């Protein structure tokens, strides 16, 4: 018995198990590596998502068929007040 009509799978097996997360703040699993020739640069930032709005933009994209033409699209607005440092943590590399 060979299914008679092949069809793609429903849903992605990479995002399993589907479950409620441990917090309303998702932790970050991975960072950009380390570039030790640059100034001291803070990587990520944290703010609060607040609604959406619409934006028209003059699409300056050479090669496209909307070059030098107007394109409307939707953006998000995230409230981003300043953020204050309170701690420093060092990590030792182990064979674990």
């Amino acid at each position: 018995s060979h299914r008679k009509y092949e069809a793609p799978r429903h849903g992605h097996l990479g995002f399993l198990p589907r479950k409620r997360a441990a917090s309303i703040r998702a932790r970050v699993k991975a960072f950009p590596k380390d570039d030790r020739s640059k100034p001291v640069a803070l990587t990520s930032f944290l703010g609060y998502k607040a609604g959406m709005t619409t934006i028209v933009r003059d699409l300056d994209r050479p090669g496209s068929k909307f070059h030098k033409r107007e394109v409307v699209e939707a953006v998000t607005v995230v409230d981003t007040p300043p953020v204050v440092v309170v701690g420093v943590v060092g990590y030792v590399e182990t064979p674990r």
């Binding site: 300056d60 050479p62 090669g63 030098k68």
Partner: protein
Amino acid sequence: IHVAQPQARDDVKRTPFIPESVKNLKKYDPEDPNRRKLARDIEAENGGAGVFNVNLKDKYLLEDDEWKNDIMPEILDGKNVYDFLDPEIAAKLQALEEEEEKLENEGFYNSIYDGFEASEVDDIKEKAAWIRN
């Protein structure tokens, strides 16, 4: 192989028009040490064909090259600027600024019951307010 004719209709006729700048123009030569470059050669000298960006501006005539790259407002609170701009705006606006001055003096902008005074014209409205409640 039929060919047609003007067929002698009217006395008014054109000679065909060629601008003198085309007759003054040199003929273009493909393999040429000294020549005008092209739109191709400016395109391929920095990035490929599809990825090079061409300014549509800096190709058009104006009074001053300082404002060849300025940006029109195109929208304000008042509806849209391409409808408001004109020749002689301020000449037409002084005909509007004169329409204030004839109305200001004549009392077009300006800020009482018979037989009933301040204690009596108030209290009839005060007694009627109790009756509606």
